[PDB]
Design an enzyme around this catalytic site. Structure first.
Site, short mmCIF file in Angstrom:
data_model
loop_
_atom_site.label_atom_id
_atom_site.label_comp_id
_atom_site.label_asym_id
_atom_site.label_seq_id
_atom_site.Cartn_x
_atom_site.Cartn_y
_atom_site.Cartn_z
N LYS A 56 -20.55 -16.65 -0.28
CA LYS A 56 -21.93 -16.22 -0.03
C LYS A 56 -22.58 -15.51 -1.18
O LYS A 56 -22.02 -14.54 -1.73
CB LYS A 56 -21.97 -15.26 1.18
CG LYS A 56 -21.38 -15.80 2.48
CD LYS A 56 -22.19 -17.00 3.00
CE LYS A 56 -21.87 -17.30 4.45
NZ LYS A 56 -22.11 -18.75 4.76
N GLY B 96 -14.20 -3.27 -0.77
CA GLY B 96 -15.63 -2.93 -0.75
C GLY B 96 -15.94 -1.84 -1.79
O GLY B 96 -17.00 -1.88 -2.41
N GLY C 136 -10.61 -8.07 -3.09
CA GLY C 136 -9.52 -8.41 -2.22
C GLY C 136 -9.17 -9.88 -2.14
O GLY C 136 -7.98 -10.20 -2.02
N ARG D 190 0.82 -1.23 0.00
CA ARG D 190 0.00 0.00 0.00
C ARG D 190 0.85 1.29 0.00
O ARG D 190 0.54 2.24 -0.71
CB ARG D 190 -0.98 -0.01 1.17
CG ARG D 190 -2.32 -0.62 0.81
CD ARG D 190 -3.11 -1.09 2.01
NE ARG D 190 -4.43 -1.55 1.59
CZ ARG D 190 -5.27 -2.28 2.32
NH1 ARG D 190 -4.96 -2.66 3.55
NH2 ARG D 190 -6.44 -2.63 1.80
CL LIG Z 1 -12.72 -10.91 -4.42
#
Ligand SMILES: [Cl-]
Ligand SMILES: [Cl-]
Ligand SMILES: [Cl-]
Ligand SMILES: [Cl-]
Ligand SMILES: [Cl-]
Ligand SMILES: [Mg+2]
Length: 392
Positions: free
Chosen positions: A195, A372, A349, A34
């Site tokens: 999910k 996200g 991610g 990062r």
């Molecule tokens: Cl992913």
């Protein structure tokens, strides 16, 4: 969409409040990427003679100064990488931040304290946004991964200052924006992970866009069940069965080519040393569970990937950190790497973790670090930290 970047504005002498992602995993820093990711932006600003004021979150302090989540070591590491005396402020606003800004010369770098130390950050408190703005002349947003939330350092500040993208954000918006608005075709999305719930928005929106939809991971067994196949002990969200049926119906009516597993690796016990076998998708034994896509499915998915000019991948084909459940995810990564005619976009991610793990990250065309944020963007949401950027 077409947002101004730091390439499009005169920066010499300007105080630039530059929102970056320095949320590195930590006692001391244990992953540096990062900070590296941020370097081209910081350097570009330094060369233009901007006064570079860097803002980032780190961990979860929940609105107070926690001493082990200060950005001090990140500032020390950044200094090493730039070969520059990077200064660091123990507050991100108020008189201390202000005075350290007042003391800056052109080309200087100042790392502000962890923006999450302040309760008003997450609440997008206008007064805190104005205080951040008091430090600068221009807002540069280089943290796509933070831009999906309306926070003082990600969006609120743009109420008071001009606002442009940094180099990372520019590239994220170029790639993801093009994928939604004028993709190369055929366009495939690969949607996986455990999910269905987590991917509902993405499935829904990309069924309006793609030519090919490929599913896998634990998510797929809900679709298998929805067709009336038996799934044994596989993960299934019974309240999403009818949604899955409706998604397959949408694909059929639109002529989207819909790829689900045709064979599955199954086991009686999930574990790192699991005993497995491969069965066709209509032959899942009642007391086994699906844990990866089978080799017939890997071959089909590879062919589809090789014949798609744009592929966006969000979610693995199985729990790939477990040795026996990794091959489907490995195969998808390899196919993207092997596909000389395909622009490969890694959209989340866990897919990003997988390509790094299996050694093909270097061969992906774009790896998003929005997390996200990249999911929300690909769902067609307006990200507060993107909308506030000034239009070209
Ligand atoms: Cl992913
Ligand atoms: Cl594209
Ligand atoms: Cl829907
Ligand atoms: Cl999974
Ligand atoms: Cl249609
Ligand atoms: Mg290539």
């Amino acid at each position: 969409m077409n947002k101004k970047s730091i390439r499009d504005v005169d920066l010499k002498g300007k105080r630039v409040f530059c929102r970056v992602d320095f949320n590195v995993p930590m006692g001391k820093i244990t992953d540096e990427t990062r900070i590296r990711a941020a370097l081209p932006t910081i350097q570009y600003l330094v060369e233009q003679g901007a006064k570079v004021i860097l803002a980032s979150h780190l961990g979860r302090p929940k609105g107070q100064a926690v001493e082990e989540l200060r950005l001090t070591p990140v500032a020390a590491r950044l200094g090493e990488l730039l070969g520059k005396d990077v200064k660091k402020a123990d507050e991100a606003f108020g008189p201390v931040a202000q005075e350290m800004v007042a003391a800056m010369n052109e080309g200087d770098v100042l790392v502000l304290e962890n923006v999450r130390f302040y309760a008003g950050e997450e609440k997008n408190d206008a007064e805190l946004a104005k205080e951040f703005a008091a430090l600068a002349d221009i807002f540069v947003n280089d943290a796509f991964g933070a831009a999906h939330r309306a926070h003082a350092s990600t969006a609120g500040i743009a109420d008071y200052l001009p606002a442009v993208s940094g180099l990372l954000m520019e590239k994220e918006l170029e790639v993801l924006g093009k994928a939604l608005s004028n993709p190369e075709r055929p366009f495939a999305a690969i949607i996986g992970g455990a999910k269905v719930k987590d991917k509902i928005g993405l499935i829904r929106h990309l069924l309006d866009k793609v030519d090919n939809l490929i599913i896998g991971g634990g998510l797929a067994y809900t679709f298998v069940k929805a067709l009336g196949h038996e799934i044994g002990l596989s993960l299934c969200e019974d309240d999403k069965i009818e949604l899955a049926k409706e998604f397959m119906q949408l694909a059929k009516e639109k002529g989207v080519n819909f790829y689900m597993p045709v064979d599955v690796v199954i086991t009686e016990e999930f574990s790192e040393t699991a005993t497995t076998k491969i069965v066709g998708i209509d032959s899942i034994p009642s007391n086994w569970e699906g844990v990866d896509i089978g080799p017939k499915t890997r071959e089909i998915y590879a062919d589809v990937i090789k014949n798609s000019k744009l592929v966006v991948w969000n979610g693995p084909m199985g729990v790939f950190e477990m040795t026996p459940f990794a091959e489907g995810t490995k195969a998808v990564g390899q196919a993207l790497a092997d596909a000389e005619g395909t622009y490969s976009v890694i959209g989340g991610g866990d897919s990003a973790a997988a390509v790094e793990k299996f050694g093909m990250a270097d061969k992906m065309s774009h790896i998003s670090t929005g997390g996200g944020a990249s999911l929300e963007f690909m769902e067609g949401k307006e990200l507060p930290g993107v909308v506030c950027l000034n239009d070209k």
